[PDB]
Amino acid sequence: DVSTSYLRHNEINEYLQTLSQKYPSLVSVEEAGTSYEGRSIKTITINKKPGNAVVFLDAGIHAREWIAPATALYAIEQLVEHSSENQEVLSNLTWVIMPVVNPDGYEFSHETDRFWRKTRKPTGKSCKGTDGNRNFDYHWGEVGASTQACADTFRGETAFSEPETRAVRDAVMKLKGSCKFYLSLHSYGNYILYPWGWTSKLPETWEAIDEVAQAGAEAIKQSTGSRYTVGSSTNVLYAAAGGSDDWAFAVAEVPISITMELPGGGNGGFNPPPSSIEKIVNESWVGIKAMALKVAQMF
Amino acid sequence: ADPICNKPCKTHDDCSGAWFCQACWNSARTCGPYV
Ligand SMILES: [Zn+2]
């Protein structure tokens, strides 16, 4: 259903609203903010129960990473339309899922430039766009972030200069204390990463996050056999200071903060053909559910 | 269209002049795009 094609941002929002109409006692669809160009950045809250641990999942902060919102939508479909098959992650866990963080870039990638990455807000002439995953206010503007407005990793004019990242900030801040698992979906590379993105040194509680990441990689290995490399983002992939996972872990005090690089496909890596969507999201959901189950089992 | 893609690298400078695969992936040790 949601894994047969790449949905446009408007179609994604209508799907969320339809689920709100169809499952009002299970889900609530809320607007977390407005993009720079005026698009509604929506989230869906699944199984809201008082005192529950909260899993916050976002995707599509980078425009060209189409498989990340597709995986997030597939996770929504499994949890909402097939809740009877996912009771283990629907008892003490509450899900807040933001399928698209950067709708302006995402729509731009569909219409104008397939491999656009940043947002679409002008940066002060001659270039548009800010790297959303370099725009969070924790070690902002440091190694792995560029001061040049035209670079792929432009940190932005200031920290949280983009309304898209402010929407993520406000949604996670509203769940401070209750949010125990922050998951940010990216593509590509087959990685499950955690802080830090500003140094190669590991956080004090890196083992706890590593165990959650190991569970996701192990479940995928048992299910499909695909390999996911686990480690800190700086050590495994590259330095990425200003990322959302670092900010959620350190500022929002989310104990388990993970960035996931979903499988690549096509000639550019970011563009698997629509026929490949179903297999990729199915495999990715196996890992995502396993990490959430590991989080739920902590209590 | 980017010949620097999948070029072996130790640091980001080995991926200079790439325009798409500007990042040196640490585990892969090859030039790739920002993901
Ligand atoms: Zn990304």
Whether A198 and A274 have beta carbons less than 8 Å apart is answered as: no
Q: Please give the Cα distance from A58 to A43 (Å, whole number).
A: 9
Residue B8: domain span? 1-35
Domain extent for A60: 1-299
Pairing status of strand A191-194 against strand A229-232: parallel
The angle formed by the CA atoms of residues A295, A31 and A47, to the nearest 5 degrees, is: 35
Tokens of A34: 């407005």
Q: Sheet harboring A40-46: ordered strands across? A: A27-34, A40-46, A93-98, A53-59, A179-187, A256-262, A191-194, A229-232
Question: Which DSSP string corresponds to A105-122?
Answer: HHHHHHHT-TT--S--SB
Distance (Å, whole) CA A93 – CA A79: 11
SS3 A79: helix
Alpha-carbon distances, residue B33 vs A6, A33, A97, A160 (angstroms)? 21, 29, 26, 24
Domain count, chain A: 1
**DSSP helix/strand/coil, A258:** strand
What are the CA-CA distances from residue A154 to residues A128, A200, B1, B32 (Å)? 10, 21, 23, 17
Q: Is A65 on the interface with B (CB under 8 A)?
A: yes
Residue B32's H or E segment, with its range, is strand B31-32
Determine the longest span between alpha carbons in chain A, in angstroms.
Answer: 52
Report which residue type is found at B19: W
Judged by CB atoms closer than 8 Å, whether chains meet at B27 and A261 is answered as no
The answer, for B27 touching chain A at a CB cutoff of 8 Å, is yes
B23 alpha carbon – ligand 1 mean position (Å): 13
Q: For residues A30 and A43, what is the distance between their CA atoms, to the nearest angstrom?
A: 5
To the question of whether residue A155 is assigned a binding role by annotation, the answer is no
Torsion of CA A110, A57, A83, A264, to 10 degrees: 50
The residue whose two tokens read 């089992």 is A297
CA–CA dist A172, A54 (Å, integer) = 10
Q: Which amino acid is at A4?
A: T
The distance in angstroms from the start CA to the end CA of chain B is: 18
CB A165 within 8 A of CB A154: no
Q: Please indicate the experimental technique that yielded this structure.
A: X-ray
The Cβ of residue A14 has, within 10 Å, a number of other Cβ atoms equal to 12
Instruction: Quote the CA–CA distance of A4 and A277 in Å, as a whole number.
Output: 7
DSSP-derived secondary structure letter, A157: S
The yes-or-no answer on residue A278 being catalytic is: no
How many domains, in total, are found in chain B? Answer: 1
Chain centroid to CA A121: how far?
Answer: 20
Non-local (6+) Cβ contacts of A286 within 8 A are: A219, A220, A223, A224
- Which residues, 6+ apart, have CB-to-CB distance to A149 below 8 Å? A123, A124, A126, A127
Q: Where are the beta strands (DSSP E) in chain A?
A: 27-34, 40-46, 53-59, 93-98, 179-187, 191-194, 229-232, 256-262
Contact A280, A71 (CB under 8 A): yes
Resolution in A: 2.2
Contact of A203 with A275, CB cutoff 8 Å: no
DSSP A202: P
Cβ of A115 within 8 Å of Cβ of B20? The answer is yes
Q: State how far residue B7 is from chain A, nearest Cα, in angstroms.
A: 15
Indicate the helix (H) or strand (E) that contains B31: strand B31-32
**Cross-strand pairs, A229:** A191
Q: In the 8-state DSSP scheme, what is residue A38?
A: S
